Structure formats: structure tokens, C-alpha cells
Amino acid sequence: MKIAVAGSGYVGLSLGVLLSLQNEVTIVDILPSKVDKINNGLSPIQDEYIEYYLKSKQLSIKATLDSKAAYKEAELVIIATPTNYNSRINYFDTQHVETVIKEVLSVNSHATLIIKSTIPIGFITEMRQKFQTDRIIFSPEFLRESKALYDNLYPSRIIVSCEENDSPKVKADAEKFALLLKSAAKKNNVPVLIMGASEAEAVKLFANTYLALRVAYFNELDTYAESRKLNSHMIIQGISYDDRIGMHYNNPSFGYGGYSLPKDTKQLLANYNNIPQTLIEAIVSSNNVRKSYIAKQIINVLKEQESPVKVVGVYRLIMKSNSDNFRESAIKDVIDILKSKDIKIIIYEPMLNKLESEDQSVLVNDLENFKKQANIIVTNRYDNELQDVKNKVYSRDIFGRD
Amino acid sequence: MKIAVAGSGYVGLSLGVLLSLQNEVTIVDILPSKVDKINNGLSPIQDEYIEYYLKSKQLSIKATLDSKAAYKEAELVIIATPTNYNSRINYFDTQHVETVIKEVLSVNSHATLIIKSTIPIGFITEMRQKFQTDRIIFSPEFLRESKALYDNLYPSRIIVSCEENDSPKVKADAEKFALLLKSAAKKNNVPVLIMGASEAEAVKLFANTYLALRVAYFNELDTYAESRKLNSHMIIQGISYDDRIGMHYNNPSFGYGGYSLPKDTKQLLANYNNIPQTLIEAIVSSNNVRKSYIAKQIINVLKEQESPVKVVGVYRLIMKSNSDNFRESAIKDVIDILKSKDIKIIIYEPMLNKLESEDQSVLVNDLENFKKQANIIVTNRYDNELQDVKNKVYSRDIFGRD
Ligand SMILES: NC(=O)C1=CN([C@@H]2O[C@H](COP(=O)(O)OP(=O)(O)OC[C@H]3O[C@@H](n4cnc5c(N)ncnc54)[C@H](O)[C@@H]3O)[C@@H](O)[C@H]2O)C=CC1
Ligand SMILES: NC(=O)C1=CN([C@@H]2O[C@H](COP(=O)(O)OP(=O)(O)OC[C@H]3O[C@@H](n4cnc5c(N)ncnc54)[C@H](O)[C@@H]3O)[C@@H](O)[C@H]2O)C=CC1
Ligand SMILES: O=C(O)[C@H]1O[C@H](OP(=O)(O)OP(=O)(O)OC[C@H]2O[C@@H](n3ccc(=O)[nH]c3=O)[C@H](O)[C@@H]2O)[C@H](O)[C@@H](O)[C@@H]1O
Ligand SMILES: O=C(O)[C@H]1O[C@H](OP(=O)(O)OP(=O)(O)OC[C@H]2O[C@@H](n3ccc(=O)[nH]c3=O)[C@H](O)[C@@H]2O)[C@H](O)[C@@H](O)[C@@H]1O
């Protein structure tokens, strides 16, 4: 089948390559760099499986900047563009998704549009009324960065929306798409759920909010443990042996980061409007409180030192273990708070070439010089190459993952 | 070994019977009824395994009101008395545990005292200083009511506290006790953790608080679902397929109830004092908000009816599925809120013989009359015997469990 995918990020590229094994895929983007990379078998992001598929699999995939040409030819269009949370409007800025819907509808009268980008609850319904069509459905995406294609090869589940009174074509396409994902998976028993759009939009926001809830909870337990001089690993291990709690996704950090959890928890809170709740709002505030607590602990360690200048060395800015980006990295907010103090900040981050011109932080990518200059080394996740300066490293990492 | 157990409740009786297979157990209580029942092979509470063991196993177990005689003879004393949360003092009322420690210490100079009752973080340390001894340790209890003995036959884990500078005897007893629990289990691979008292006290409060967090979260998702006319089962099923979230302990209700979750979440919040957090306090408030929301939904359904008198029929007061008690049952708080309105309340609850004299609610244990009189039937968990009046039943139960 001829499929067009809007957006070549983690989601777009993962799905485009997944679907390119037995379908004719065209990935659309507005960045020439990504288009040329893809057209030459190169992945714009670090991902073991995407890199492997582009390099060694028979794929029917190409990229283009020509939006209209790609969408006109498509039988199905998958939308995977950004959906940033905008603090000014207290909501997701859905312009990049809407602009694609408009473009697709203006040149294609038969294709069903499938949104993979995380969206507000009620968005499909709002878009269907705005554009006066039923050819728009949602299929949430659950992949994790660094396992973008892997998670669609071995998905937890597949969900696609369909409304009772949708046209036979849209209903058939919703089903066909769910089955294209199922058949492309290498995993044998993948649950497939077909539900209303609002239910599906809710699934995605409530699932990510639960993951943020869990990180936030283990981080508050960790705040307590550090404040009371208790062994955090012993306590976490003790509660995690209850299989209703579990030994996964329970490693303390400076806060939940990444492009997704921060913005999605905020979006869910907004969708609640005045519906009664107290936990949803606390999951968002808990991250802020955790970050401020971490900043104060660092500040207190520093004032216990006798040095003319106090220098904090930040070891890495990656948003989680094995990440290739710093989107909403928790340590960056901690840094912001430390900056309001008389503290010099140096950053060790190989993936970065230069800091923005106004940044007062100083990038020191020679590890040895970095260790020498830092009075204290702050890092979200520990790494063995810090072994020789271990006694001046501050981190709440316990399990070395996530 | 000669073991004395203080308290014949779910915890005390479960452990006393468990340990009575290969040890000489004496259970102590202040209620003559419980002592006579136990001495005659009868369980004071409903529990399939305890009833089976008392009736068909070779047990070395007896009960007595004679506290001092039991404690003087003991080699180990297990304390399983109440630890209620007291709203006036903003803390657990630990008098029943302290009174037992005092009694044991006054007549026994060698036995180590093991607390199974859930206690405040820092309590062992406080008690050790108050009584000036190190012969007091904590071993949290994780059993569920209705599976009291079953959960100790198949425990998730075993935890016993020990401090680095405790006497060789207390350290040896801490270990021996952990191994008495391990060897008495029928489960083969049970993790055994030895940790500091404060860490162990924290494990118990943080584990129960996570279970309350989970119930509170799925209940807030349910509030949202009902408010927006969405299918709650579809949404919950959709997020639960993520194995990091899970298909367990996720059934909506009128709130988390039982003697334990309500009081333990409140106790943890108190132990936090001013340590930074926002989630811990929200887990407690979320229950209140959920209950008030449920009461309003019922009130709204009622005002849509044209009857001279509006009657709400409450189907059962049990605190959870298969429970034999109503401790902190969520529906009771909902009832309290409905009472401030012009609503007649009738209750169907076979396990109850009479309501307190001042109660304006009326107990109607003839099911047929109950169904006839109720304009709307409210219940925490559905039951098939309500099939014929299904259209007037209000419940948020989805999965028929917990
Ligand atoms: N990153 C992840 O792990 C997951 C992200 N999501 C959601 O999927 C959406 C995309 O996320 P990512 O893939 O991480 O984003 P990304 O930022 O990595 O990639 C977005 C791409 O879309 C391109 N783009 C912007 N406007 C476009 C337009 N008008 N037409 C065509 N291309 C356009 C951008 O140039 C960029 O290459 C977001 O809503 C995100 O919340 C969902 C699951 C996982
Ligand atoms: N019920 C449960 O599922 C679990 C309860 N726990 C904790 O264990 C403790 C006990 O809970 P339950 O067993 O449910 O209580 P319960 O209320 O069922 O039983 C307590 C028993 O102790 C007796 N008692 C009171 N003072 C006594 C004294 N001074 N000397 C001797 N006996 C005395 C009472 O008469 C009563 O029979 C509480 O701290 C509870 O939080 C821990 C795990 C599970
Ligand atoms: O919607 C999305 O975009 C995706 O967001 C997350 O995936 P991802 O953002 O790649 O990252 P996670 O591995 O979930 O971690 C998120 C943040 O929480 C933090 N975290 C996670 C787990 C943990 O134990 N501790 C912890 O601090 C991580 O360091 C990271 O900053 C979800 O796991 C995906 O299912 C979802 O599809
Ligand atoms: O400390 C205790 O005393 C015990 O408390 C709970 O056991 P229990 O109180 O018997 O009851 P649960 O089955 O945990 O249920 C607690 C409350 O949450 C509610 N709940 C639970 C699960 C769920 O999916 N939905 C839900 O509403 C139940 O209806 C009930 O009112 C814990 O499960 C035990 O591990 C712990 O040892």
C-alpha cells in the first residue's frame, strides 16, 4: 500500500521504516537534512534497529520536502509531527498537526488520516467538526526513544480509533491500519483494541501520566530517604518485591524528563478543566518540588567547601539513560536554579558542540579538565568513568537505567 | 520454640497459626470471645486457610487473657495489636503497642520483641530510647484480609529489622525470626531482606501508600471518564496493557477503604513533616474528592426522579470484595454526605444485625423489600443477585474484584 508519513522524528521514522517492508512509504519533513539522510539510508537519530533496517533490509522508503506530492499519492497518511505544550495558552499547540490535516485534505479526497502524535482528549472530534469530515482517526504511539522501532516490532498493544457512525471506508481503513501494525510486528500475541477517539486519546495521556506518577512517587520517597539519612535502595527494593508494585521503572532521578512526560502530564491536567481531582495536578507540581529539592542539596554541599570559587561540574545533559537528546532534561532545570546563585557551571556533554551564546555555563568536553575544575560533580545517572572522582559525585541514581 | 503473639486479629491469628505448626504458640488478647473461640478451634474472622488449619492441622496453639503468664514464658514475642490513626494528634495512636512492650519487658528479660503492627517511621528508635533497650525490632506485615494466612504461606517477601550495633542475641533473634517465617512458608523462593528499622518502617508505609496511590489514580481517571461520558473499561484496559502499568489492582470504586490504606497514607504524610512533597498529601485528599464526587453523582440521579420520597438503597457495606468487615468502607463516607440531604437511606447488609441506635439509616435485610423501596441502588461492587433491578443500580465497579 502507498503510505505517506508526516514527520521524520522518533515516531515518524520508526513507523515509516516499519511499514516500508511491505508497503510503499514516503516520509515527509520540512528539514532538508532529514530528507537527504533518509534518502541515503541514514537515520537522523540514534536507534539500533532503524539504523540496522535502513542499512540491511529491503525497504520501499523515500523522503521528500514535497508535501503535496506525497499526500496526493497516498492511500493512508500517518501524522507524526510535534505537539508541544505551550505554557501561554495552557494547552498543546496543535498547529503542526492541523497544518498537515489541512494540506492532506486539500489534495486527497479518499485517504484516511491517522494521527500518531499525542493529542488533546477531544481533538479528533474537534478536528472532525473544524474540517467537516470523518476521515481523521487516532492511533496512540507507545514507543520509547532509543527503542523506537524495537517497540513497534514488539508492541505492548495496538489501538486505533473508529466511531460507530463513521463511513464504511474510514471504519475499514481504521481496521486495516491496526492490522498493518499487527502484521508488521515480530511479536506473536499483540492485543488490538478498537475504541472511540476520545477513549483512545485518554489512554495515551493517562498511560504517560501514570508513568510520570510512578517516577514522581519514587522520587518523593527518595527525597524522604535522603532527608532522613535512610538507605533509599533498601526501601525501594523492599516495596518493589510486592509484584503489584514491581521491580521496574523505579529508579530515582532529578525529575521525570524527555519531550513527552513533562508536556503530556500538563496536557492531561488541562483537559481535566474543573473535573474533580487532586492527584493529576500534584503529579505536575511534584516534579518542580523534586527539582528544587535537588538544587538545594547541591547548594548545601557546596557551602561546606572552602574554595575561592565554587564550581559545579554537570556530567551529561541527556534526558535519560542511553538518550541522544536533552529535551526537558531534568538536570537543566536544576542548573537554572543553581545559576541564580554565585556558582560557576561547567558542562561535560560530548554530544554538544557549543552552548547558546548567552549561556554563562561553560562547556568543558575534555573529561580530565572537567573533573579537575569541578568542586562537585552533578549527574542524573552515574557512569564508571567517574570512578576516580567518585567521592565528589552527587547523583540519586540507584539502578543504572531509565 | 515458645512464641507469644499479642493480638488475635487478622495479623495476630494468621501468624500465630502459621507459627504453631512447628512452634509452641500462645496468642494473647483482651477479648474473652476471641480467646474461647481460638481455644476451641474456631477462627474469629472469615479466612479459608485459618479455618482449615485450626480444624485439620496438628497445631500447638492456645489463647489466653493472662498477658503476663504468656509473656513471661515466651522466647520471642510478636506484637500485632491495633495502630489506629488519630485525627486529633495528627498521628498513629501507638498506645496498644507500647502497653504490650511495657508488659513484656517487665516480666521477660531475654525475649526479643518483634512488632508486626504497622508503625510510624522512627518508632523502633523512639521505643528503644524510651524503654532503654535494643530488644525491639520491626518486621512489616504484607497480608491481605481474606487471604491472611494464604499470604504468609505464599509471601511476596520477608523483611526483619536489625541495627549494626545491636546485641548478638537481638541480631540472632532477628535472623531466626526471618527464617521461621521463611521455613513456614510453602512458597519456595521467598526473598528475605534484613535492614535498619527506619528503612523497614518506611517500606511498609511507602508500599501501602503506593497501593492507595494506584487506587486513587484509577478512581480519578474514572471520575474523568464518567464526567466526559467515556467508556472507563476501554480506557483502563488500554493503559493496563502496558506491562509497566499492569492489569491488576485497577478496579474503580467509591474510594480506597479498609483499616489500613486510609490510616497508613495519613501516617506517611505526617512522617513527612515539612520534607518537600506534593504527591503524598494529594493521595490522601484524592480519596475525599473522589467520595464527594460519587455522592454528587447519586444526588443528581435522584433529582431526576419524580417520587414523593427519594430513597437510596445501599447494597452492602463491606470494605472490599469478599470482606467480612466495614472498616473505613468508602461507601460509608458517601452515605454520610447523602445524609445531609433530604434522602432516606436503607441498607442491605446481611453481616449486620442492627445499626447503632442513633443511625437514621434503616437496615432492610430482606433483599426483595430492599429492592422495592429503593429508588436507586448504590453499591461499591456489583453482584448478580441485583440483575432484576440492574437499571437502577449505580456502581463504578468494572472488573468484579478488589
Ligand atoms: N518521541 C517519542 O518517544 C514519542 C513521541 N510521541 C509523539 O509523537 C509526536 C512526534 O514526536 P517525535 O517523533 O519525538 O518528534 P520529533 O521532534 O523527533 O520529530 C518531529 C518531526 O516533524 C517535522 N515536522 C514539523 N512540522 C512538519 C510539518 N508541518 N510537515 C512535515 N513534517 C513536519 C519536524 O521537522 C521533525 O523532524 C509528538 O506528539 C510526540 O509527543 C509519541 C510516542 C513516543
Ligand atoms: N488487617 C490487615 O490486613 C493488616 C493489618 N496490619 C497491621 O497489624 C495491626 C493489627 O491489625 P489487625 O490484625 O487487622 O487488627 P484487629 O483489629 O483485627 O485485631 C487487633 C486485636 O488486638 C487485640 N488487642 C488490643 N489491645 C491488646 C492488648 N493490649 N493486648 C493484647 N491484645 C490486644 C484486640 O482485641 C484485637 O483482637 C495494625 O497495625 C494493622 O495496621 C498489617 C498488615 C495487614
Ligand atoms: O510518549 C512518549 O513519547 C513516550 O514517553 C516515554 O518514553 P521516553 O520519553 O522515551 O522515556 P522513558 O524511558 O519513559 O523515561 C521518561 C523520563 O522519566 C525518567 N525516569 C524513568 C523511569 C525511571 O525509573 N526513572 C526515571 O527517572 C527518565 O529518566 C526520563 O527522563 C514512554 O515510556 C513511552 O511509552 C511513550 O511512548
Ligand atoms: O496493611 C494492611 O493491612 C494490608 O492492606 C492491604 O490489604 P487490605 O486492606 O486487605 O485490602 P486491599 O485488597 O489492598 O484493598 C484496599 C482498599 O482499596 C480498594 N481497592 C483495591 C484495589 C482495586 O483495584 N480497587 C480498589 O478500590 C479496596 O476495595 C479496599 O477498600 C494491602 O493489600 C496489604 O498488602 C496490606 O498488608
From Swiss-Prot, chains A, B:
Changing residue 141 to Q: Increases Km for substrate 3-fold. Increases Km for NAD 2-fold. Reduces catalytic activity about 10-fold. InterPro entries: 6-PGluconate_DH-like_C_sf, 6PGD_dom2, NAD(P)-bd_dom_sf, UDP-Glc/GDP-Man, UDP-Glc/GDP-Man_DH_C, UDP-Glc/GDP-Man_DH_C_sf, UDP-Glc/GDP-Man_DH_dimer, UDP-Glc/GDP-Man_DH_N. GO terms for molecular function: NAD binding; UDP-glucose 6-dehydrogenase activity. It catalyses: UDP-alpha-D-glucose + 2 NAD(+) + H2O = UDP-alpha-D-glucuronate + 2 NADH + 3 H(+). Its EC number is 1.1.1.22. It is an enzyme of class 1 (oxidoreductase). The active site is at residue 260. Pathway: Nucleotide-sugar biosynthesis; UDP-alpha-D-glucuronate biosynthesis; UDP-alpha-D-glucuronate from UDP-alpha-D-glucose: step 1/1. This is UDP-glucose 6-dehydrogenase.
